[PDB]
Design a protein around this ligand. Structure first.
Ligand SMILES: C/C=C\C=C\[C@@H]1O[C@](O)([C@H](CC)C(=O)NC/C=C/C=C(\C)[C@@H](OC)[C@@H](C)[C@@H]2O[C@H](/C=C/C=C/C=C(\C)C(=O)c3c(O)ccn(C)c3=O)[C@H](O)[C@@H]2O)[C@H](O)[C@H](O)C1(C)C
Ligand SMILES: Nc1nc2c(ncn2[C@@H]2O[C@H](COP(=O)(O)OP(=O)(O)O)[C@@H](O)[C@H]2O)c(=O)[nH]1
Ligand SMILES: [Mg+2]
Length: 391
């Protein structure tokens, strides 16, 4: 099976409170579009609620969609998943309204930079009262505004992921205009096509892909998955595996796939599987980056400009201090780092911007201008930018 690039590629996903319908909507999206484009493989709700990374396309674009379980123990996974989204679909149940996770996922989306949000008010089959429905929309729009998303401008589609999914199960060929529920899914697909702009991909820069996960394709070798950040990659390309391990490893690409389909060449923006030559799953891991040889190097000590979040922004009320060892989030991983403030400075208070030094306990592919977040456990306390590599 081969994958032929024909429409602009976009990465999206589902966020929202537990049980509001993220997984059901993900399944509905694949079934609904499958009726038009045969290249769209059907994905049962049972399987997704286990892969959780599916594909589907509209007349305008090809989409890679990650369905976030959204639980607290999956926080680190949501971070990397949301970080690679061009836009997110916020699912809110019409029968419950916004709940704690609706708010939590919105803040995380903001902190990792999700550029746009499209809302899908789910389970409307459970609520008919026009007033209650308008109240829920009002609440969601206000919630979004609260975290600085353009709440008054986002699309808010009302529908039922379950009824749409069941219709497709009954008639997999159901097409647009034939079923009111299925049509609500098309309203969402249209909103996604229109509201979420297709970003400019940095395809002309040196290849770089942060590793999300590593698997062994039984009888084929190890494969590293991730979203290409910049550049391109194809079979026969030499690539370096940088960071985390003791030394940088160099190998050759033996395969490139898009949703398990042979891909001519992967480009920035594509979430692919890169099969590597002679490397075991013990030589490549999440957090490392695949890159054009010599384009990026591993480091542990650097200087950075850092903004300490205010308590009013979810951070702490106490500041940073020398010897502090929080977690530093770089691309797809997080590593402990020791903070060292300049002479004379005993503390950097919330709300202040300062430049200090850091020494990670493990090497990481670093470069000037690279952004990173600082978290202490499950709380974001700082936002920084690498300003100088020391070693
Ligand atoms: C966020 C986790 C990892 C991020 C890692 C890296 O982040 C980056 O470095 C990123 C770059 C900026 C980063 O460093 N993010 C790191 C940080 C970035 C932070 C900014 C931008 C901000 O400005 C100060 C804006 C959100 C700003 O804040 C406001 C937020 C107020 C929140 C109040 C919540 C309070 C009282 C609260 O009790 C509360 C709640 O209500 C819900 C949930 N919980 C848990 C809470 O406790 C408003 O929303 C504004 O918009 C890049 O994205 C990297 O590529 C990435 C993704 C690798
Ligand atoms: N009545 C109704 N139930 C729904 C709808 N969408 C999802 N559900 C159900 O609500 C439950 C949670 O759905 P799921 O997609 O797993 O929620 P998630 O935690 O956000 O992923 C399941 O039992 C689904 O069948 C809907 O539109 N209407
Ligand atoms: Mg789910």
């Amino acid at each position: 099976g081969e994958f032929i690039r024909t429409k602009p590629h976009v990465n999206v996903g589902t966020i929202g409170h537990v049980d509001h319908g993220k997984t059901t909507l993900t399944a509905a999206l694949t079934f609904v579009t499958a009726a038009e484009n045969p290249n769209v493989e059907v994905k049962d709700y049972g399987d997704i609620d286990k892969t959780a990374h599916v594909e589907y396309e509209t007349a305008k674009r090809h989409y890679s969609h990650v369905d976030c379980p959204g639980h607290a123990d999956y926080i680190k996974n949501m971070i990397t998943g949301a970080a690679q989204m061009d836009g997110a679909i916020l699912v809110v149940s019409a029968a419950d309204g916004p709940m704690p996770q609706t708010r939590e996922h919105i803040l995380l989306a903001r902190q990792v930079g999700v550029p746009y949000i499209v809302v899908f008010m789910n389970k409307v089959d459970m609520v008919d009262d026009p007033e209650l429905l308008d109240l829920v929309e009002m609440e969601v729009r206000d919630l979004l505004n609260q975290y600085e998303f353009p709440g008054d401008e986002v699309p808010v589609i009302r529908g039922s992921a379950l009824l749409a999914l069941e219709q497709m199960h009954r008639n997999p060929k159901t097409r647009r205009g034939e079923n009111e529920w299925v049509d609500k899914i098309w309203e969402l697909l249209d909103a996604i096509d229109e509201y979420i702009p297709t970003p400019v991909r940095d395809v002309d820069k040196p290849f770089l892909m942060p590793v999300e996960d590593v698997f062994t394709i039984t009888g084929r070798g190890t494969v590293a998955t991730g979203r290409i950040e910049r550049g391109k990659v194809k079979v026969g390309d030499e690539v370096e595996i940088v960071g985390l391990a003791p030394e940088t490893r160099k190998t050759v690409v033996t395969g490139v796939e898009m949703h398990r389909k042979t891909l001519q060449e992967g480009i920035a923006g594509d979430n692919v599987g890169v099969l590597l030559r002679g490397v075991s799953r013990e030589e490549v891991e999440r957090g490392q980056v695949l890159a054009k040889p010599g384009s990026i190097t591993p480091h542990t000590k650097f200087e950075a400009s850092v903004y300490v979040l205010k308590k009013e922004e979810g951070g702490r009320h106490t500041g940073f201090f020398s010897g502090y060892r929080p977690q530093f989030y770089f691309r797809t991983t997080d590593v402990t780092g020791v903070v060292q403030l300049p002479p004379g400075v005993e503390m950097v208070m919330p709300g202040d911007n300062v430049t200090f030094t850091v020494e990670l306990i493990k090497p990481v592919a670093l470069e000037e201008g690279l952004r990173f977040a600082i978290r202490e456990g499950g709380r974001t306390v700082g936002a920084g930018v690498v300003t100088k590599i020391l070693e």
